[PDB]
């Protein structure tokens with residue numbers, strides 16, 4: 001298992017524009033297009049991302065290309081964040097995948113506002129962090145996904161995904 005497979009499981013793959021759990025226009029493997037309610041704006045953002053007149057539909061290859069770029073941007077966002085970087089550097093490989101997952105889902109901003117959990121993870125207080133991470137809107141809105149990521153941080157294994 002790895003980050004890509006993990007995210008592919010959590011986000012699914014859709015080749016036509018769709019609304020995410022928050023109701024935002026998305027495509028592919030969790031690639032958010034726009035928070036705007038307008039489908040046209042979403043179609044415009046899509047064509048600009050792909051480099052062609054898509055008409056709201058993309059191929060599997062195109063989806064995977066966006067996905068690769070988004071994973072890379074997520075990591076890079078982490079490494080560029082002064083609050084996040086040190087925590088991430090302190091984690092083992094599996095737990096780093098859990099960190100990427102969260103940033104991919106909620107943005108560096110989102111995740112950067114979990115100070116208490118960050119400190120706990122940095123200290124390797126797994127069970128405590130796990131409890132703290134669950135006291136969040138994120139957990140209450142997407143509990144099954146949050147549970148899988150939380151178990152990953154708690155155990156340092158891919159069990160939740162097997």
Ligand SMILES: CCCCc1ccccc1
Nearest residue numbers: 084087088099102111114
């Ligand atoms: C809980 C804080 C957000 C997830 C995260 C953890 C460590 C490093 C980067 C990102």
Ligand SMILES: [Cl-]
Nearest residue numbers: 048049050069
């Ligand atoms: Cl893009």
Ligand SMILES: [Cl-]
Nearest residue numbers: 142143144145
């Ligand atoms: Cl869920």
